[PDB]
Write a structure and sequence with these properties.
3 copies of one chain form a homotrimer.
Chain A (H helix, E strand, L loop, with lengths): L2 E2 L7 E5 L10 E8 L10 E6 L2 E7 L14 H11 L3 E10 L9 E2 L3 E5 L25 H14 L3 E2 L3 E5 L7 H10 L4 E3 L2 H10 L3 E10 L10 H22 L24
Parallel strand pairs in A: 2-5, 2-6, 6-12, 7-9, 8-10, 10-11
Antiparallel strand pairs in A: 1-3, 3-4, 4-5, 6-11, 7-12
Bound molecules: adenine (3 copies).
PDB class: transferase
Keywords: A/B structure, transferase
Assembly: trimeric
Chain lengths: 273, 273, 273
Amino acid sequence: EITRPPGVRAHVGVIGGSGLYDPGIVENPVEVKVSTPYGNPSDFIVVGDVAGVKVAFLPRHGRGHRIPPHAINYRANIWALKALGVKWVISVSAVGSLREDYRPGDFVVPDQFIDMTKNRRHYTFYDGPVTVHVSMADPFCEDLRQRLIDSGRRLGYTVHERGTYVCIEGPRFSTRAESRVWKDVFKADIIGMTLVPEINLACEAQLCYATLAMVTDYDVWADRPVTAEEVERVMISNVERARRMLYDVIPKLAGEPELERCSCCRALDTAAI
Amino acid sequence: EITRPPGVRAHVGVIGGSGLYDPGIVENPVEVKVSTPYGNPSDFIVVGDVAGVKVAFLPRHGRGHRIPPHAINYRANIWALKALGVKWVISVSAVGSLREDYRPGDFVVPDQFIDMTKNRRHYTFYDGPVTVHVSMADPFCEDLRQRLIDSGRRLGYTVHERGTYVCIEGPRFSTRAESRVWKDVFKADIIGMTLVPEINLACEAQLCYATLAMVTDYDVWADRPVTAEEVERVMISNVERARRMLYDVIPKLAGEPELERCSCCRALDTAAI
Amino acid sequence: EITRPPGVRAHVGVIGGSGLYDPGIVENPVEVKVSTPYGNPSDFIVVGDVAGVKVAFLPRHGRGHRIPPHAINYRANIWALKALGVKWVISVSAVGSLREDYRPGDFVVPDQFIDMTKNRRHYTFYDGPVTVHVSMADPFCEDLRQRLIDSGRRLGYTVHERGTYVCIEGPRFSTRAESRVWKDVFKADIIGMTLVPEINLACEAQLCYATLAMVTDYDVWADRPVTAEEVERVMISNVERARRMLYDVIPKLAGEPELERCSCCRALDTAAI
Ligand SMILES: Nc1ncnc2[nH]cnc12
Ligand SMILES: Nc1ncnc2[nH]cnc12
Ligand SMILES: Nc1ncnc2[nH]cnc12
């Protein structure tokens, strides 16, 4: 693919808030434009070096939080990261909690999801003539999941070691009746808006993708229901711990994901017809 | 600031003997001239990469040990390192011991100091119109202190985990009556000449600064009093172990100091009037 | 020495199969031509960055396995690596086993060897007028040996922590009568063809050289004798584990070999007459 500047490559993708990028850490940073067949990624991708590992930072909402979950160009974002050569993708996300013990401030590394989105327009890169049906029974990359969990232990942070993420459409938050269904009927653990189709596309791109979620609220279940202001307040309060995990994890990603602990790394071998 | 070559940046500063720099380790080294408002730093600063971390080496005495402690341009040295963008500063220093159990050859990572210098001419960057009074109750950066101690453990070296450094003016060594005061009255543990005002300035520059001291002698207290030849002999005999600690520590400094374990990292927030 | 491109340097050499090099890991790779007084190394040396450590990859048999053990330009290979500035050399090798418990698939980090080659033409760089006789009582670099063993532990792989490598001339495999001598009379543990004079030369070049061997067969001792096809099949089946060890080890080699655990690092101090 064509990039400007030309010849830019990266090994680890980081998708999350723009505040995750730290210019006091990232060496030789460059803003890069990566052509995609889907138009513009959410913003410039910043490529630079962390402990000799080339990292590509992409704020999914854009800098300044300009793009709500439903309006994100998921195809452009994942195509651009794949085009740069990334093998690992760390997503960092805010989520609501549907269980007491997943408390605001806790990290969660989910292992499952339930897609309840409706309006994302494309849930795949493959519209024909090659039909592709990737197996997403175990949709996250286990190698990266365990690395995120390990970093949490090293740093003394609470990181819940499993969880089912119900992805809703939004942008409005759940009603109480919907939340009762997510919590009591589907038995989901956390709730967010951006996981799908981001993870679908990452899997189709044969990336090792895992999510580091930060609980920001209890959705409808506390005395006062979740608000946008509450979510953003808790995220900004905890972004420093998110960065510490991120910059602890990245230096250990110089190598490749272990294929037998990366469900999607060879997804296309048996997915295409 | 203006540098030659231009655009040089660094993340970790190393202040100590020129023998600490190892061209067999440091990748892409460049000698850099960093303008300061105080004139020349002690020598060229050599910037290069250690395990993907950009390090700036500055010999405080100059190459060849040309500059005694009292003649060092402390302001130029710290300004130049800060101007390059460093966040961490590892100082490596020779010190005398005032206690039997801090033996020649032992490393010491001090946590306190007593300033008994008199002739250093500037003890601060701030002469007005903004008055700055940094809190130096806990003057060293705890994050870096514990990292130096940890490396010592990994390598099997003795590293005393605390100590009070009495900084004297010199260049002449202490009389017996002075040493009795340092040891028995002030209850200092080690003695050197270069800590102040280097640490003051580093703190004002909002750097995470810690000292790795190497005991070279027992000042007046052994049968034969300390001499310059003795200090230099023990330092050169132990410089290889100093390097091993240095190159063990640096690769783990890709990230930022933890603010809550870095007393000076936000010193200016409440220090300026 | 003259290189094309000019000014290329490296810190760690990797000698083994071309399949060890992974373009998904190695940053900023460049093929480099390094002049030697002995003509062409086995192939281009690929220099690039792994976790900020500069690595030089050299396939001893050439890409495509074009050069049998007896035809390898050992002097050119080691001269070229030394000329680039490497301090560490990791050799990865296939070997036969002469003992039940060194099983196909197991790694072995040998500590000794017995040279039974005959036709390698030069066993040294030093033909006069400076006579050089390096001590090779303990011919491998202990620092690197223990690092290879440590990586094996971290990864959960079997790595035998000692072994005597009998190096035969080849290219034909041993007869049964020869194998009985290696196994029962010399009491060797593993057998290969490429160790000598590669290790001699590395030692004379004052490199920290260690071998990570992979058992591929039991030479004559199983029901069916070893064949070339069998060796290559087991190697290709296990190359991924070899890579995982290699890319686990390399990031920890930013520093220098420890002289007191590197028998050859100062070999020339007392070897030359
Ligand atoms: N309660 C919630 N519902 C949906 N998305 C969220 N993101 C953060 N909290 C959320
Ligand atoms: N005894 C001593 N007094 C002052 N500075 C020193 N540096 C090393 N040893 C010393
Ligand atoms: N049995 C064997 N003999 C010699 N070299 C070998 N390399 C691998 N297996 C071998």
